[PDB]
Design a protein around this ligand. Structure first.
Ligand SMILES: [Ca+2]
Length: 194
């Protein structure tokens, strides 16, 4: 959809987090509005990120070694030192592609679990990080495990102290493990000022 903030009909693809900032991906253009930003700005990705593809599927950082990961098609890049390894046309197939995966919805990493899961339209996968062995398919359901977000999740990123920012469509729902209760019902254009 369009970034039209003054209009309820916007959607996202992927969203990541860096340090204390939140970056939103939009097809080929990215958004920026955090820390000290009264308004957002729609700029081109390639504009900055050189060796980086467009149309990121799922963006998720790793608050451990200060790295970043950008998913796109049946390939993924590895951001290292604010720089995506050059000539790294890796492919999930390398060790992931279960049945016929290639396009993910979102992906987040749980610090209080040490596991990273993703969404495939309407599937809940979980890849063991510590063990380093992905589960056998694990055709679970999101809305199931977590009732409140929905069976479909657009972007998902862990930006808080102990919460989970989830969104799908034009609503930014937040989950609190405190008691699996969502006490935040806003839209994507609720900060910008529309
Ligand atoms: Ca996504």
């Amino acid at each position: 959809m369009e970034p039209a903030l003054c209009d309820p009909n916007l959607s996202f693809d992927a969203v990541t987090t860096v340090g204390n900032k939140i970056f939103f991906f939009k097809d080929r253009f990215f958004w920026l509005k955090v820390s000290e930003r009264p308004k957002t700005s729609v700029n081109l990705i390639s504009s900055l990120w050189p060796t980086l593809p467009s149309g990121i599927e799922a963006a998720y950082e790793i608050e451990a070694r200060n790295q970043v990961f950008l998913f796109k098609d049946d390939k993924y890049w590895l951001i290292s030192n604010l720089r995506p390894e050059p000539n790294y046309p890796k492919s999930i197939h390398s060790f992931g592609f279960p049945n016929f995966v290639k396009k993910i919805d979102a992906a987040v990493f749980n610090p209080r679990f040490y596991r990273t899961y993703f969404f495939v339209d309407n599937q809940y996968w979980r890849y063991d990080e510590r063990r380093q062995m992905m589960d056998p398919g694990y055709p679970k359901l999101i809305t199931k495990n977590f009732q409140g977000i929905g069976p479909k999740i657009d972007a998902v990123f862990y930006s808080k102290n102990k919460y989970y920012y989830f969104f799908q469509g034009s609503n930014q729902f937040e989950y609190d493990f405190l008691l699996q209760r969502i006490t935040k019902t806003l839209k994507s254009n609720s900060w910008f000022g529309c």
